[PDB]
Design a protein around this motif. Structure first.
Motif, PDB file in Angstrom:
ATOM      1  N   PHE A  44      13.014   8.966   4.752  1.00 21.35           N
ATOM      2  CA  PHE A  44      11.980   8.335   4.063  1.00 21.35           C
ATOM      3  C   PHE A  44      12.510   6.400   4.183  1.00 21.35           C
ATOM      4  CE2 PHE A  44       8.931  10.902   1.568  1.00 21.35           C
ATOM      5  CZ  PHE A  44       8.770  11.799   2.804  1.00 21.35           C
ATOM      6  N   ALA A  45      13.917   6.554   3.605  1.00 23.58           N
ATOM      7  CA  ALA A  45      14.503   5.288   3.382  1.00 23.58           C
ATOM      8  C   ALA A  45      15.137   4.399   4.902  1.00 23.58           C
ATOM      9  CB  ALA A  45      15.580   5.257   2.484  1.00 23.58           C
ATOM     10  N   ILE A  46      15.342   5.175   5.793  1.00 26.53           N
ATOM     11  CA  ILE A  46      15.805   4.602   7.060  1.00 26.53           C
ATOM     12  C   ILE A  46      14.436   4.302   7.941  1.00 26.53           C
ATOM     13  CG2 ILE A  46      15.849   6.274   9.067  1.00 26.53           C
ATOM     14  CD1 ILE A  46      18.831   5.930   9.159  1.00 26.53           C
ATOM     15  N   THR A  47      13.537   4.822   7.393  1.00 29.26           N
ATOM     16  CA  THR A  47      12.268   4.778   8.335  1.00 29.26           C
ATOM     17  C   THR A  47      11.353   3.595   7.766  1.00 29.26           C
ATOM     18  OG1 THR A  47      11.644   6.798   9.189  1.00 29.26           O
ATOM     19  CG2 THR A  47       9.798   5.603   8.235  1.00 29.26           C
ATOM     20  N   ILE A  48      11.677   3.218   6.414  1.00 24.63           N
ATOM     21  CA  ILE A  48      11.024   2.072   5.806  1.00 24.63           C
ATOM     22  C   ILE A  48      11.843   1.033   6.193  1.00 24.63           C
ATOM     23  CG2 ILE A  48      12.539   2.068   3.614  1.00 24.63           C
ATOM     24  CD1 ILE A  48       8.611   1.759   3.800  1.00 24.63           C
ATOM     25  N   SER A  49      13.077   1.030   6.945  1.00 25.53           N
ATOM     26  CA  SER A  49      13.559  -0.148   7.209  1.00 25.53           C
ATOM     27  C   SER A  49      12.896  -0.967   8.480  1.00 25.53           C
ATOM     28  CB  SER A  49      14.933   0.271   7.791  1.00 25.53           C
ATOM     29  OG  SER A  49      15.679  -0.859   8.281  1.00 25.53           O
ATOM     30  N   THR A  50      12.063  -0.052   9.300  1.00 22.99           N
ATOM     31  CA  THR A  50      11.157  -0.730  10.301  1.00 22.99           C
ATOM     32  C   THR A  50      10.136  -1.464   9.995  1.00 22.99           C
ATOM     33  OG1 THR A  50      11.655   1.743  11.210  1.00 22.99           O
ATOM     34  CG2 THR A  50      10.279   0.105  12.467  1.00 22.99           C
ATOM     35  N   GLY A  51       9.392  -1.305   8.779  1.00 22.55           N
ATOM     36  CA  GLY A  51       8.214  -2.022   8.467  1.00 22.55           C
ATOM     37  C   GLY A  51       7.058  -1.553   9.303  1.00 22.55           C
ATOM     38  N   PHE A  52       6.653  -0.009   9.534  1.00 24.40           N
ATOM     39  CA  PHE A  52       5.728   0.340  10.068  1.00 24.40           C
ATOM     40  C   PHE A  52       4.380   0.214   9.427  1.00 24.40           C
ATOM     41  CE2 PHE A  52       4.249   4.695   8.921  1.00 24.40           C
ATOM     42  CZ  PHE A  52       4.335   4.584   7.422  1.00 24.40           C
ATOM     43  N   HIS A  54      -2.630   4.124   0.496  1.00 25.34           N
ATOM     44  CA  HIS A  54      -2.324   5.237  -0.533  1.00 25.34           C
ATOM     45  C   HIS A  54      -1.519   6.296  -0.166  1.00 25.34           C
ATOM     46  CE1 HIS A  54      -5.818   3.438  -3.082  1.00 25.34           C
ATOM     47  NE2 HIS A  54      -4.922   3.383  -3.544  1.00 25.34           N
ATOM     48  N   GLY A  55      -1.548   6.574   1.222  1.00 24.49           N
ATOM     49  CA  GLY A  55      -0.630   7.516   2.005  1.00 24.49           C
ATOM     50  C   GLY A  55       0.993   6.885   1.899  1.00 24.49           C
ATOM     51  N   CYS A  56       0.780   5.500   2.265  1.00 27.41           N
ATOM     52  CA  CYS A  56       1.926   4.681   2.288  1.00 27.41           C
ATOM     53  C   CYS A  56       2.678   4.597   0.930  1.00 27.41           C
ATOM     54  CB  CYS A  56       1.685   3.285   2.833  1.00 27.41           C
ATOM     55  SG  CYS A  56       3.096   2.221   3.231  1.00 27.41           S
ATOM     56  N   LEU A  57       2.204   4.579   0.126  1.00 25.32           N
ATOM     57  CA  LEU A  57       2.884   4.665  -1.316  1.00 25.32           C
ATOM     58  C   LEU A  57       3.790   5.935  -1.628  1.00 25.32           C
ATOM     59  CD1 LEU A  57       3.247   2.166  -2.940  1.00 25.32           C
ATOM     60  CD2 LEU A  57       0.745   1.968  -2.723  1.00 25.32           C
ATOM     61  N   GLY A  75      -3.587  -4.400  10.634  1.00 19.66           N
ATOM     62  CA  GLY A  75      -5.208  -4.292  10.401  1.00 19.66           C
ATOM     63  C   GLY A  75      -5.919  -3.237  10.289  1.00 19.66           C
ATOM     64  N   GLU A  76      -7.038  -3.098  10.225  1.00 13.67           N
ATOM     65  CA  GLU A  76      -8.076  -2.146  10.466  1.00 13.67           C
ATOM     66  C   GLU A  76      -7.588  -0.767   9.606  1.00 13.67           C
ATOM     67  OE1 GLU A  76     -11.769  -2.936  12.530  1.00 13.67           O
ATOM     68  OE2 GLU A  76      -9.908  -3.937  12.057  1.00 13.67           O
ATOM     69  N   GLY A  77      -7.655  -0.816   8.410  1.00 16.52           N
ATOM     70  CA  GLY A  77      -7.120   0.466   7.718  1.00 16.52           C
ATOM     71  C   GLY A  77      -5.626   0.613   7.567  1.00 16.52           C
ATOM     72  N   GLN A  78      -4.711   0.066   8.290  1.00 14.69           N
ATOM     73  CA  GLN A  78      -3.236   0.152   8.015  1.00 14.69           C
ATOM     74  C   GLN A  78      -2.588  -1.167   7.470  1.00 14.69           C
ATOM     75  OE1 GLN A  78      -3.356   3.028   8.901  1.00 14.69           O
ATOM     76  NE2 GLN A  78      -2.591   3.614  10.759  1.00 14.69           N
ATOM     77  N   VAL A  79      -2.103  -1.348   6.556  1.00 15.36           N
ATOM     78  CA  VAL A  79      -1.337  -2.518   6.332  1.00 15.36           C
ATOM     79  C   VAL A  79       0.071  -1.930   5.971  1.00 15.36           C
ATOM     80  CG1 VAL A  79      -3.496  -3.172   4.964  1.00 15.36           C
ATOM     81  CG2 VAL A  79      -1.623  -1.860   3.814  1.00 15.36           C
ATOM     82  N   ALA A  80       0.825  -2.962   6.834  1.00 13.26           N
ATOM     83  CA  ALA A  80       2.340  -2.637   6.836  1.00 13.26           C
ATOM     84  C   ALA A  80       3.154  -2.285   5.611  1.00 13.26           C
ATOM     85  CB  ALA A  80       3.116  -3.907   7.758  1.00 13.26           C
ATOM     86  N   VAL A  96       3.867  -3.921  -1.456  1.00 12.64           N
ATOM     87  CA  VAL A  96       3.278  -2.890  -1.878  1.00 12.64           C
ATOM     88  C   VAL A  96       3.581  -2.310  -3.183  1.00 12.64           C
ATOM     89  CG1 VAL A  96       2.269  -2.400   0.494  1.00 12.64           C
ATOM     90  CG2 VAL A  96       4.471  -1.153  -0.448  1.00 12.64           C
ATOM     91  N   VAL A  97       4.586  -2.545  -3.735  1.00 11.00           N
ATOM     92  CA  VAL A  97       5.159  -1.752  -4.740  1.00 11.00           C
ATOM     93  C   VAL A  97       5.653  -2.961  -5.745  1.00 11.00           C
ATOM     94  CG1 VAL A  97       6.895  -0.331  -5.756  1.00 11.00           C
ATOM     95  CG2 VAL A  97       6.232  -0.012  -3.260  1.00 11.00           C
ATOM     96  N   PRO A  98       5.140  -2.881  -7.067  1.00 11.80           N
ATOM     97  CA  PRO A  98       5.377  -3.906  -7.990  1.00 11.80           C
ATOM     98  C   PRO A  98       6.541  -4.027  -8.559  1.00 11.80           C
ATOM     99  CG  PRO A  98       4.135  -2.095  -9.075  1.00 11.80           C
ATOM    100  CD  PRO A  98       4.109  -1.741  -7.523  1.00 11.80           C
ATOM    101  N   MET A  99       6.985  -5.497  -8.360  1.00 11.05           N
ATOM    102  CA  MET A  99       8.281  -5.705  -9.094  1.00 11.05           C
ATOM    103  C   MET A  99       8.104  -5.634 -10.450  1.00 11.05           C
ATOM    104  SD  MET A  99      11.057  -5.847  -7.292  1.00 11.05           S
ATOM    105  CE  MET A  99      12.243  -6.961  -8.466  1.00 11.05           C
TER     106      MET A  99
END
Ligand code: ZMA
Lengths: 220, 212, 296
Positions: free
Chosen positions: C57-65, C70-73, C148-153, C159-162
């Protein structure tokens, strides 16, 4: 201070039951598992089982499942062991031991404190007073002898000259001759003192309520 | 289940020399092995727990060691208070088992037994028994042998031996041996011999009598 | 940054190996199975998820896909669910040792195996509910754009509140339970040393056995070390978020700093079995036995 105080010796006929008690003073009784061990012929040790004094829950060694049943009373803070359908093979000394516990990362267990032991003797013998026989000779030392034979139950208490004869004595462990015990003691003394001085055997066996004193006298 | 077995079954030692006794579990118990010391007529006392750990106020000269299936208790520079029999116990698992114990006895110089034989007491014969008793007194080491002869012929049936433990004066051993017959067969015989062998005597020690 | 990958996988595998061994040990050695150790197993399995789940999960988040907010969180905030499940266990354990050592007589009947299940359950319930709050509607998103269109990087400080990350998951969920464990142990270490010094000034053993206390306490000291390491692995990440969050004015944490803290935090799931081997005879002996048999 912590004492485990066990109920006293038991003499029983085979086929009967017994409750041996262990009272514990000087700590909290419900904090620790009480275990019972049996020692046969003052040598080998067997773990009988144990009991959680809080909930009365028990684990038993399989060998003893059904012969032993463990129970507790919190109030008087004492643990019990009851033995059923008793046979001679059950004659032994039963101890209570208090188990103890801590976390080493593993669960460490040991038997912290033990009771004094309680002696259970099962036999079908009826209580029998002994025959005492004096054993004379037929050197610079003479050994005399006293033969206590055919008594039940143990013990007998044997003295020579009412304890006034201290040194020289050997009192041997008793042996079962069929149903009944037979025992023997020997004194050896400087021959200057026997037959010269009077030397007698004293035998008490309270069970039959008897004291016999036999003087040892030269033969023919 | 898990079978505990220790060695040796008896060990005799001089005060001041060092001793090791071993204990072998039939399964792998890690630590979970404990050691008890039981003095004669006393109840066992806690010696070492966790296989390495000494109990409160146990003299530093004792040490436990080992793990898995092999354990040993070692007493450095033995003391007079240390003599007695030693037990190990595993707490691994639900059901627990002890050792056979090992009996630690005092070594002393060998000693020749004093042997005395005695005929049936006339108090007893007029009952109708006959018991020839034989005393073997104050010998070391514990190993001794008694043959009975009746008129030269050996006799095995009807014999009962009893041994003392080490004496509290000289710590030597003694034993009574009594051949018991019926007055009827006692009187069928003239000679009665009670014969002892021991490491100290290179000839059998022979004590005997002839009835009448 | 292909190196940040090699170390993460090196940590991924390491963590699964060591921690499965802890669980294999406890399953296996009969002495290892006790309440105190269920909280340790809950602790190991919560460290296996990290190797199995949160690193991929953490190595994949390094890409910025790209992916649905709500599935991204879920993929960024799963680690929160674990790190937090860790903490309830360490704190469970601590209480356990505290009760066990400070109140030895009431313990056997107070702490039980099934009461232990209750905690472990509730602590997993409250770890998800707490870890996934950003899924509950605490989302910072809907209000590099090719997506765009339903996908937000998917990035962390977007996305995650500081907000929730500094105040709620650090202050409330970590600093507090940590300062709580520092107290509970120090209370044991300081209580035990008086009990040990008060057996000295007095003759005879009892009520407690001295040798057997300092043996309980050495294992407590050993369980506290773990706590301290957690602070050492998870603190910098927060120290850094503090410096970044309290200044959504002042400058932001650099490159070779951040990934170093993410690694450093993920390191937390490796050293644990290693401490047990060094500091605890019973695990060390089961590890050894296991390894010299099943791996031989
Ligand atoms: N703030 C933050 N960032 C990251 N990675 C993002 C690094 C980054 C740095 C700069 C930039 O422009 C975009 C991204 N992982 C993070 N993990 C955590 C965390 C989880 C639990 C406690 O802290 N916080 N956190």
């Amino acid at each position: 201070e912590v004492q485990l105080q066990q109920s006293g010796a038991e003499l029983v006929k085979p086929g009967s039951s017994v409750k041996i008690s262990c009272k514990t003073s000087g700590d909290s009784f419900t904090a620790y598992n009480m275990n019972w061990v049996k020692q046969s012929h003052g040598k080998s040790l067997e773990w009988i089982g144990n009991i959680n004094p809080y909930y009365g829950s028990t684990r038993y060694n399989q060998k003893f499942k059904g012969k032993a049943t463990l129970t507790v009373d919190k109030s008087s803070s004492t643990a019990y062991i009851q033995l059923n359908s008793l046979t001679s093979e059950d004659s032994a000394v039963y101890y209570c031991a208090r188990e103890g516990n801590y976390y080493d990362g593993g669960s460490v267990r040991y038997f912290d404190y033990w009771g004094q032991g309680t002696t259970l003797t099962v036999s079908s013998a009826k209580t029998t007073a002994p025959s005492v026989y004096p054993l004379a000779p037929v050197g610079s030392s003479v050994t005399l002898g006293c033969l206590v034979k055919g008594y039940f139950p143990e013990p007998v208490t044997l003295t020579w000259n009412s304890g006034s004869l201290s040194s020289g004595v050997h009192t041997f462990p008793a042996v079962l001759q069929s149903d009944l015990y037979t025992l023997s003691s020997s004194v050896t003394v400087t021959s200057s003192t026997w037959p010269s001085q009077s030397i007698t055997c004293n035998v008490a066996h309270p069970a039959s309520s008897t004291k016999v004193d036999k003087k040892i006298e030269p033969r023919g | 289940d898990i079978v505990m077995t220790q060695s040796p079954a008896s060990l005799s030692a001089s005060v001041g020399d060092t001793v090791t006794i071993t204990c072998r579990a039939s399964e792998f118990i890690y630590s979970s092995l404990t050691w008890y010391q039981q003095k004669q007529g006393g109840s066992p006392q806690l010696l070492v727990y966790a296989a390495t750990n000494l109990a409160d106020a146990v003299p530093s000269r004792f040490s436990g060691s080992g793990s898995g299936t092999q354990f040993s208790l070692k007493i450095n520079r033995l003391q007079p208070e240390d003599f007695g029999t030693y037990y190990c116990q595993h707490f691994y698992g639900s059901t627990w088992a002890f050792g056979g114990g090992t009996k630690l006895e005092i070594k002393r110089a060998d000693a020749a037994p004093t042997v005395s034989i005695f005929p049936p007491s006339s108090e007893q014969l007029t009952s109708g028994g006959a018991s020839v008793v034989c005393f073997l007194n104050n010998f070391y080491p514990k190993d001794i042998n008694v043959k009975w002869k009746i008129d030269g012929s050996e006799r095995q049936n009807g014999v009962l031996n009893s041994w003392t433990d080490q004496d509290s004066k000289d710590s030597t051993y003694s034993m009574s041996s009594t051949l018991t017959l019926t007055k009827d067969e006692y009187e069928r015989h003239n000679s009665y011999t009670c014969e002892a062998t021991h490491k100290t005597s290179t000839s059998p020690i022979v004590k005997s009598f002839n009835r009448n | 940054s292909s190196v940040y990958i090699t170390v993460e996988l090196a940590i991924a595998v390491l963590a699964i190996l060591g921690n499965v061994l802890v669980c294999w040990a406890v399953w296996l050695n009969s002495n290892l199975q006790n309440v105190t150790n269920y909280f340790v197993v809950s602790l190991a399995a919560a460290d296996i998820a990290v190797g199995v789940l949160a690193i991929p999960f953490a190595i994949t988040i390094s890409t910025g896909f790209c992916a649905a907010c709500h599935g991204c969180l879920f993929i960024a905030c799963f680690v929160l669910v674990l790190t937090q499940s860790s903490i309830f266990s360490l704190l469970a354990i601590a209480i356990d040792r505290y009760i066990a050592i400070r109140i030895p007589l009431r313990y056997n009947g107070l702490v039980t195996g099934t009461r232990a299940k209750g905690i472990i359950a509730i602590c997993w319930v409250l770890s998800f509910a707490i870890g996934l709050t950003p899924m509950l509607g605490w989302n910072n998103c809907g209000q590099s754009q090719g997506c765009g269109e339903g996908q937000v990087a998917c990035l962390f400080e977007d996305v995650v509140p500081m907000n929730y990350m500094v105040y709620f998951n650090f202050f409330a969920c970590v600093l507090v339970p940590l300062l709580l464990m520092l107290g509970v142990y120090l209370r044991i270490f300081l209580a035990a040393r008086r009990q040990l010094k008060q057996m000295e000034s007095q003759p005879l053993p009892g009520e407690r056995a001295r040798s057997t206390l300092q043996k309980e306490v050495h294992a407590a000291k050993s369980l506290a070390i773990i706590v301290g390491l957690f602070a050492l692995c998870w603190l910098p990440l927060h120290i850094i978020n503090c410096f970044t969050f309290f200044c959504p004015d002042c400058s932001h944490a650099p490159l070779w700093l951040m990934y170093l803290a993410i690694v450093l935090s993920h390191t937390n799931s490796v050293v644990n079995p290693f401490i047990y081997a060094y500091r605890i005879r019973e695990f060390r002996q089961t590890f050894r036995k296991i390894i010299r048999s099943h791996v031989l």
